[PDB]
Amino acid sequence: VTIVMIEDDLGHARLIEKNIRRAGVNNEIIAFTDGTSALNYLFGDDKSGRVSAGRAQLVLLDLNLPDMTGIDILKLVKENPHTRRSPVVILTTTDDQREIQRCYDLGANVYITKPVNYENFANAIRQLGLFFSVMQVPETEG
């Protein structure tokens, strides 16, 4: 079971990662700072998604990416039969209800607005790590 972290802000990226570690989670964390590299990983060279077939992974997704919108990755993921079952957790800046509703309708499992306050942000990630250890992350179809 792996954690796929799609975040472009390197500061948040390293903050999230270490607070996950502080939660006791020792799972492999594969990160991407843009949508292009993250999609290649989730869908493979041929973009079919089959490389994700049978994978047990959870994806953290910042909506604001440089080369595309996180929403696209969400739709792609929840549409493909080899990735859709992967729990997607939106972890982004905006707390725009329209954006929240849209994300859930697109298939997001959980949506989290990044707290402003550093302490609040680090604590939230830590809770996420603890919750992660409590949930069941399923493998996608083969």
Add this chain to the structure above:
Amino acid sequence: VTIVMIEDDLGHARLIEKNIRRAGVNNEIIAFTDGTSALNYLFGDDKSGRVSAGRAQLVLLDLNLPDMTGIDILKLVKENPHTRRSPVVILTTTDDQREIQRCYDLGANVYITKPVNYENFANAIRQLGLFFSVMQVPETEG
């Protein structure tokens, strides 16, 4: 934001409830010990689900109910417009892939296998309550 707890085991129902409070969550919790009344509240007497339109609610669901199976409650909630946007957290005893994968395929936002150890069980709920206060719970369509 209302937490709808669908659990028939009175012992677990009381453990879940107090540990949610233990986590500092003061949200209204409406409990149902059978699936019938639970579906009644969620969909109404007309069964259209309009009673749920615009509601912001998280649902805790045990799959092992006395009058039906929670999986079908999940299927109904995730198919109807005024309840599908509601995050559903499966909280049950079983832990075999087939059930977990089916719940996610049916639309469950999260699946948590009840920890066997009472204390781990209580702590996990506390962990669930903390995460709840960190995530965004959307309102359903109108």
